[PDB]
Design an enzyme around this catalytic site. Sequence first.
Site, PDB file in Angstrom:
ATOM      1  CG  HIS B  41      -0.637   0.274   2.491  1.00 28.47           C
ATOM      2  ND1 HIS B  41       0.024   1.436   2.859  1.00 28.47           N
ATOM      3  CD2 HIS B  41      -0.821  -0.435   3.627  1.00 28.47           C
ATOM      4  CE1 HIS B  41       0.258   1.422   4.158  1.00 28.47           C
ATOM      5  NE2 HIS B  41      -0.257   0.280   4.656  1.00 28.47           N
ATOM      6  N   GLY B 143       2.990   6.729  10.027  1.00 26.03           N
ATOM      7  CA  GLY B 143       4.391   6.456   9.656  1.00 26.03           C
ATOM      8  C   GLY B 143       4.916   5.199  10.331  1.00 26.03           C
ATOM      9  CB  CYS B 145       2.692   1.496   7.554  1.00 24.34           C
ATOM     10  SG  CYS B 145       0.939   1.679   7.944  1.00 24.34           S
TER      11      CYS B 145
END
Lengths: 301, 305
Positions: B41, B143, B145
């Site tokens: 993603h 942030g 991820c």
Amino acid sequence: SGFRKMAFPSGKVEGCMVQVTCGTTTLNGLWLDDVVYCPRHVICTSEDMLNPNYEDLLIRKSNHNFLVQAGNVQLRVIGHSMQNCVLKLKVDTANPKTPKYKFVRIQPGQTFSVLACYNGSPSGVYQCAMRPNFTIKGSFLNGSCGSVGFNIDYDCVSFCYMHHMELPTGVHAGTDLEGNFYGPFVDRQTAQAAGTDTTITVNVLAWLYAAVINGDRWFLNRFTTTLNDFNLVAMKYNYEPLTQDHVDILGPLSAQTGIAVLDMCASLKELLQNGMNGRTILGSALLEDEFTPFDVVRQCS
Amino acid sequence: SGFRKMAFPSGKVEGCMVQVTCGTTTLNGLWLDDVVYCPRHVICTSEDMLNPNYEDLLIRKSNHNFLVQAGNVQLRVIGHSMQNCVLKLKVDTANPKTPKYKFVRIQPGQTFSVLACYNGSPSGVYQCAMRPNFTIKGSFLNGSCGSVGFNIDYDCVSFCYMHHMELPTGVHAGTDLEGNFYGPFVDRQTAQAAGTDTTITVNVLAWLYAAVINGDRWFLNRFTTTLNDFNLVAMKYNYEPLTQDHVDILGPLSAQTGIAVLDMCASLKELLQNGMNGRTILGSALLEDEFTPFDVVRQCSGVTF
Ligand SMILES: COC(=O)[C@H](N)Cc1ccc(F)cc1
Ligand SMILES: [Cl-]
Ligand SMILES: [Cl-]
């Protein structure tokens, strides 16, 4: 979102941990530049446990009585000196893994990460606070002596604790990295006990602000309190006095949530009176006191 | 003595974290050998995320559309491919800090350490359980991820989790390192909820054993029980069923304390029905279920890496 007991990444400290042997005693040391720091009680034998004369036991040792092992490597001890309750073994190699570091003595209520170690090898990392009675509620087995506590704000490793001993109540006592004990404790096996412990009021408030940041409001109320009336109530629950310093420190969390510090003090008073009524705050059914205002801002923003 | 929620030492994993940027999206990558792993993603814009065609979005990209930074050093991406929900960015240089590692998929009730990172910088470490509903109760901001979850067995790091998303209730969803989601979740901006969660019975019993080992013993009692009887009580209180396998896994702790699992189950039966009557166990007022039997044995015996 979410809210967790969060330790600092332990890697910068892992690269400093070594095994120190003297006589039949093995524990951990902390290898920074060309110095290995460890508890001085490593030089104690069986009868040297009640009334050790450290200056007498140390003058009897040569550099070669100290066996220092960094993983598989033996380091060559070229020098030994005592500072307070910490032994400093000078070695002929500077640690190539030495991080940016400093030594800081912390106050009751401060938090830090502990890297629990056995035989110079790391076992686990967790969060502790310095209790008002100058103990920590750690997880430490035989051989964990010389394990350290630290913060890592902004790439610099601040060493604030070295583990020396377990008191009879199962709590832990130790020194700063200059070898001065936290609290009235001494590195002798003479009977010692921690003072009665109290709850770190300023940290409990910081955690309720964390609960509000994470979207919980059920425990707030329409009341307020004077600082003095708050302290008269809180101390009847063995809570630390809250000071104007503690009020100042909470100003930023007050601003972010729009709840005045003394309004949150009223919420705490009621929580102490009522309990949680089968509810939980950030997954606890108790009031948590091992997060500082600084910790809440680090983790929530 | 003492008993704490304890993460594995994170050093071996800190040396693998990098920053990955594609368009305006920065998040974290895991650098092992000559590959960087991150959530697929990263390739999406806000608009893409409502109904993303990952095949289609990915072919449109090239190697130079992926900015991979390890500290203050750009890595050169020479290849990109996707495995399920994970992007694999082949780089010109092997991680000289690559540890001995496997990719492992864990079962609900199993625990692991999370190294929360931001912009490829390790920020904090905490212990989690994969919940029965396949969420984790993490602490993650924007942030986070590409942050990862791991165990250590000797000197081998087993990577089990990569962070993808936060669900509306504040809990967390992600994949194994082969990009398979834990739980019935998808990487798109759509309506998704955590299933109703249950309590990890075998972990609660492990933590009662930790309490006894640390001299918290008030909840012990003369009674015993059976799986069948206990499991009717478990079901009633939204507790996972206790299998014969769980009794075998608790064998060590049952030995070392002289409490038999069904002896301890009798203790737990009573706590669910009666509560703690104003008491605590290891400084908790709740029945803690994020310590496995292995967690308790390892912490109470000082196992080292
Ligand atoms: C020499 O080995 C040792 O550390 C001693 N056998 C034990 C020990 C002595 C003093 C102290 F304050 C804590 C522990
Ligand atoms: Cl301080
Ligand atoms: Cl503590």
